[PDB]
Amino acid sequence: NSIQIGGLFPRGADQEYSAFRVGMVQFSTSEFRLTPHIDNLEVANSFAVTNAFCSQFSRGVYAIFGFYDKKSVNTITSFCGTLHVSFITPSFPTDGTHPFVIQMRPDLKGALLSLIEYYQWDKFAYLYDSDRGLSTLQAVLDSAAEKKWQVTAINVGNINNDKKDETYRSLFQDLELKKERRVILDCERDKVNDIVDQVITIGKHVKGYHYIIANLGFTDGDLLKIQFGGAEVSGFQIVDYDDSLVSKFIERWSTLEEKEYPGAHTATIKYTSALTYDAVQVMTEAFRNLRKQRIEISRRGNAGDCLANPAVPWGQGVEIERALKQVQVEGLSGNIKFDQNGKRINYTINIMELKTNGPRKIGYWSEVDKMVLTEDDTSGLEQKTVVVTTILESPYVMMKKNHEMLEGNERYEGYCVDLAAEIAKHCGFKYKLTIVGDGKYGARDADTKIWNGMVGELVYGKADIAIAPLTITLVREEVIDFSKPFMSL
Amino acid sequence: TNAFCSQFSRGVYAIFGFYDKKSVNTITSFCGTLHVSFITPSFPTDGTHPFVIQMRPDLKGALLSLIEYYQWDKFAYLYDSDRGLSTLQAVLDSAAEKKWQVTAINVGNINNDKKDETYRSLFQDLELKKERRVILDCERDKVNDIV
Amino acid sequence: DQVITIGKHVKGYHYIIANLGFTDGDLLKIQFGGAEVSGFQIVDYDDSL
Ligand SMILES: O=c1[nH]c2cc(C(F)(F)F)c(N3CCOCC3)cc2n(CP(=O)(O)O)c1=O
């Protein structure tokens, strides 16, 4: 038979409802159909969410897809926990252990705390919009004690649309006083586009500035505005476009016309829409495991009223929750596995970074491993260090008190060692001291015509410079270049 | 929700009652919609909400006056979430403006079987700066657990 | 548009716009940022005519 479900969509979730219907037609199978009843409402209103939940509950559904806000999350988790209806959601994962709520959004408290340590920040601003709990602000403040962080938290989300420019430009003038160059933008797309419009306008997208965008949606804003300028911006991505399942999806996603699928004719999908697409895979695969293991369930003749007295559970509901949490699919976001609370485990968050070419994956974060860097750090560039030849003469170069205990240039001291430090500082290179193997200065054999010593290590190619007591001679400057004498004798 | 609707269906003229951080949005949305004015001793709501008459005064202004009065600039702020997080934001907004170094620690996610253990882990991270000035933004029961 | 995009409308930079039409472009784009821009104007809007 077909399976009745419900949908709580916001008024403005055009792409999310478009990606919902795309996932409908792709994961449907002749055996059973997930016939929905879609309600549109505002999710910041707990009266509307109460009234729409009870319309879905009276009209016999088996699970409710939907979104919630800060205002409605406690209406949702209470109704679903009490009436044993399951709720599947792309919204923020709840702060708690709520039954009958399956969270499709992974978590980025752990990944964001790993990335601040990776850049070794210890003083930074944190701009937060309220907007979905306040739990990531609270997670960096609970860690700021034991990680030695000085965090400047600014509420950036009470701002209205007519004093927008005046509030933000006055905001970064305050941080300018404290020399804040490191900022985390814990906002969503529409708010993070407004902030990067203002950091460009007042010239804070230049070098010296670092930005971390604490979304799961790094390449969902307009990053081409801040891509040149010099500021380093970093972020997180759960939708890897360099995967086979995603690239096959973008193929059919980009060809859709924006009359039957608004917000679809493009090559990037928002992560909340990717999780809406993945949630149809999760529901369908779980209702397939419902009819597979012969657990066959009916709703009731009436479903009663949500505000019943007493409101009674229904024993089939525990099975449906347990079936929704055993799902082990692969979706646009990666591995979709839930724990017993309904929160995603075994997931991956790609740590991106904006370069002049574009956004560049510089690693990932897994729950079990940690932040894992990926293989691209081999191709940066390096300094091209300079090999410098010396010789053991006191006091020019002579080995220090502990030869073997020290490693590198620090094995050596003397006049020419202090001279090599001064030549390198003015020219601008990095050097690696090297005693000449033959332990000689350089002379030419009458038969073989081969230059020995530090001279032949410059004539033939072993070295680039010879800082030494090396006498400026006629027969030597025919084959090498001396400077003016640093010591007359 | 069920008990608001039992009194809306008995037809009352106003409702006296309490709310939590979990039920504040249920109350202010129903009373804002069905016009069933709510008189409450609970915490003042974070925003402008119609048909809610709030008998508890406020404390954000009196608390930021007292921090300035003692000339505090480095302190710990131990909070509990149950009255919202409005006063945490108020001392964090005023810390940016006035160069305070607040250590905000959520002390309300602590249960009865991990009290003596995590409280010693609490007061350990205070000794990393040797915090001597502590604000206890909890209610009566939790402030006795800390004292 | 390009000096904003690559961050050269910040302090330290000075620009002279050699038109007779200073307030005929979009100067509100570069007005904050810190760069000093200067120019010329033959049409004084603070005149009676
Ligand atoms: O370029 C040259 N620079 C040299 C520098 C020095 C030193 F003084 F140590 F710096 C000396 N020594 C002189 C005293 O006894 C120890 C070695 C020899 C050098 N020789 C070989 P020489 O001059 O033919 O004997 C060179 O060829």
β-partners of residue A389 are A434, A466
Q: Is the CB of A468 under 6 A from ligand 1?
A: no
Angle at A88 between CA A83 and CA A92, to 5 degrees: 110
- The method recorded for this entry reads cryo-EM
Can you tell me the distance from the alpha carbon of A75 to that of A47, in angstroms, rounded to the nearest whole number?
A: 9
A290's enclosing H/E stretch is: helix A271-292
Q: Is the CB of A393 under 6 A from ligand 1?
A: yes
Can you tell me the distance from the alpha carbon of A304 to that of A60, in angstroms, rounded to the nearest whole number?
A: 9
A140's enclosing H/E stretch is: helix A135-144
Contacts of A66 (CB under 8 A, 6+ apart): A6, A7, A8, A9, A43, A76, A87, A88, A89
Among candidate residues B132, B88, B85, B141, the one with its CA nearest the CA of residue B110: B141
Tell me whether A228 touches chain C (CB under 8 Å). Answer: yes
Task: Identify whether the C-beta of residue A72 lies closer than 8 Å to the C-beta of residue A91.
Answer: no
Burial of residue C37 (number of CB atoms within 10 Å: 0-12, 13-18, 19+)? middle
The packing angle between helices B24-34 and B2-9, to 10°, is 30
Structural resolution in Å: 2.8
Cβ atoms within 10 A of the Cβ of A209, count?
20
CA distance from start to end of chain C: 34
Domain A386-489 CATH (choose: 3.30.9.10, 3.50.50.60, 2.40.37.10, 3.40.190.10): 3.40.190.10
Q: Is the CB of A469 under 6 A from ligand 1?
A: yes
Q: What is the distance in A from the centroid of ligand 1 to the CA of A411?
A: 23
Q: What is the distance in A from the centroid of ligand 1 to the CA of A453?
A: 12
Distance (Å) of CA A42 to CA A8, A71, A333, B72, B85: 9, 10, 26, 43, 23
Calculate how close chain C gets to A199, using CA atoms only, in Å: 9
> Which residue of chain A has the CA closest to B4?
A307
The number of angstroms, rounded, from the C-alpha of A29 to the middle of its chain's C-alpha atoms is: 36
Closest Cα to atom 11, ligand 1: which residue?
A: A469
Can you tell me the distance from the alpha carbon of A246 to that of B71, in angstroms, rounded to the nearest whole number?
A: 57
DSSP codes, A348-417: EEEEEEB-SS-B---EEEESSS-EEE-TTGGGS-----EEEEE--BTTTBEE-S-TTTS-GGGGEESHHH
Instruction: Test A207 with C7 for CB contact under 8 angstroms.
Output: yes
Q: Looking at the partner chain, which of C4, C11, C34 has a beta carbon nearest the beta carbon of A200?
A: C4
Can you tell me the distance from the alpha carbon of A15 to that of A261, in angstroms, rounded to the nearest whole number?
A: 8
SS (H, E, C) chain B: CHHHHHHHHCCCCCEECCCCCCCHHHHHHHHHHHCCCEEECCCCCCCCCCCEEECCCCCHHHHHHHHHHCCCCEEEEEECCECECHHHHHHHHHHHHHCCEEEEEECCCCCCCCHHHHHHHHHHHHCCCCCCCEEEECCHHHHHHHC
For an interface test with A, the pick among C9, C26, C29 (most A C-beta atoms closer than 10 Å) comes out as C9
Helices marked H in A3-133 — which ranges?
A: 14-27, 46-58, 73-83, 109-118
CA distance from start to end of chain B: 36
Q: Looking at the partner chain, which of A203, A207, A228 has a beta carbon nearest the beta carbon of C33?
A: A203
Closest Cα to atom 14, ligand 1: which residue?
A: A393
Cβ atoms within 10 A of the Cβ of A40, count?
14
Instruction: Test C32 with A203 for CB contact under 8 angstroms.
Output: yes
